[PDB]
Amino acid sequence: RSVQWCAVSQPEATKCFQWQRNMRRVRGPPVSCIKRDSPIQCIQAIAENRADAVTLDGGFIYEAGLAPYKLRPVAAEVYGTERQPRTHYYAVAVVKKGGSFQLNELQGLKSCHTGLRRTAGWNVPIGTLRPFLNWTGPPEPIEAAVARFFSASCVPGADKGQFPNLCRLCAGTGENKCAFSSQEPYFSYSGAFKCLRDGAGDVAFIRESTVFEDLSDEAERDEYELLCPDNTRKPVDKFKDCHLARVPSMAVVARSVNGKEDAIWNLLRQAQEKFGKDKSPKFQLFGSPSGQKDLLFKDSAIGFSRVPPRIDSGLYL
């Protein structure tokens, strides 16, 4: 049949339907869409045969690989350039130029995170800051120690009921405040970076490219610097010498048994040829419209790379 793609929002479904009409027009391999609400709803649906595929961040790749889902990664997103390509990215800590604090001096400060359980926005910074955390738990949750450490944060998807200070800086309206979706304006890489630019937080945990994709002016880019792990501040273009971790790309996952891996692969490979970076004026696979960013796949991606057979979700990570 078709490859069924899981979409986690309404604009993502809209792009999926456009991908399906574009593949038909061009007579490529068929794709069809499914609309879920979070990434776990798409992980549940693929597992229960209602969808076949979805692209995930490293922290959810972990989660989808567990029992009883047992999903595995099939294609990794390629970043960088055509000349210098890579299947990895970098977790950074961005701050405003002018400050004096370091990575070791973050106590009581205000933070912006891409979302809860995301790689560069959460797992990496909480894994790094662990010595200052003073986590006595469990049974105390990790979010409770983080809430005590930072004065206020914006961590989309965190429980505002139990941990009110982690959603305190979040900019969404009403029930969408602290939401793990595009309705919370500080969600993801650009939202976390915008929380830093707005002045609500003193540090944003993101990836290396967000500042270059969001600030096109180079002079505007000189108002920010990175917080390195040697406790030094360095400019934004020195990410390879100033990062918290080198993390593998976001990946498309499928089922480990009867997952349609080769069908998924041929779809992606064909979609990258016809609708890739500068391939078509009609449809852009690595592109989002207007008030949207990273719909289905990351906007700055330039391709896919087939993840080898018998590679685990834990062994890919």
Closer residue to Fe ion in complex, CB, 228/250: 250
In 3D space, the residue among 27, 70, 34 whose CA is nearest the CA of residue 52 turns out to be: 34
Judged by CB under 5 A, the stretch of 116-124, 175-183, 209-217, 229-237 that binds Fe ion is 116-124
Closer residue to Fe ion in complex, CB, 31/244: 244
Burial 81-93 (b: 16+ CB within 10 A, else e): eeeeeebebbbbb
DSSP annotation of 296 reads S
CA distance 58 to 107: 27
Q: Is 208 in the site for Fe ion (CB under 5 A)?
A: no
Closer residue to Fe ion in complex, CB, 88/282: 88
Closer residue to Fe ion in complex, CB, 55/119: 119
Smallest separation, CB 122 to Fe ion (Å): 9
Contact 199, 180 (CB under 8 A): no
Judged by CB under 5 A, the stretch of 67-75, 90-98, 113-121, 159-167 that binds Fe ion is 113-121
**Number of residues assigned to the chain:** 317
Active site residues: 70, 256
Smallest separation, CB 195 to Fe ion (Å): 16
Smallest separation, CB 192 to Fe ion (Å): 11
The label of the residue with tokens 């630019």 reads: 197
Among 9, 119, 181, 288, the residue binding Fe ion under the rule CB under 5 A is: 119
CA distance 12 to 34: 10
Closer residue to Fe ion in complex, CB, 6/263: 6
Bridge-partner residues for 110, per DSSP? 152
CA distance 173 to 166: 16
Smallest separation, CB 159 to Fe ion (Å): 21
In 3D space, the residue among 312, 296, 316, 260 whose CA is nearest the CA of residue 42 turns out to be: 296
Count of chain residues binding Fe ion (CB under 5 A): 2
x/- letters, 19..58, toward Fe ion (CB under 5 A): --------------------------------------x-
Burial 126-144 (b: 16+ CB within 10 A, else e): bebbeeeeebeeeeeeebb
Query: Distances in Å between the alpha carbon of 277 and those of 11, 83, 280, 281, 301?
Result: 20, 13, 8, 10, 8
The three-point CA angle 214-216-217 to 5° equals: 125
x/- letters, 57..86, toward Fe ion (CB under 5 A): x-----------------------------
Burial 105-118 (b: 16+ CB within 10 A, else e): ebeebbbbbbbbbb
Closer residue to Fe ion in complex, CB, 153/249: 249
Smallest separation, CB 286 to Fe ion (Å): 15
CA distance 211 to 205: 12
Shortest-Cβ-distance residue relative to Fe ion: 57
Smallest separation, CB 306 to Fe ion (Å): 20
Smallest separation, CB 91 to Fe ion (Å): 8
Closer residue to Fe ion in complex, CB, 87/165: 87
Residues that bind Fe ion (CB under 5 A): 57, 119
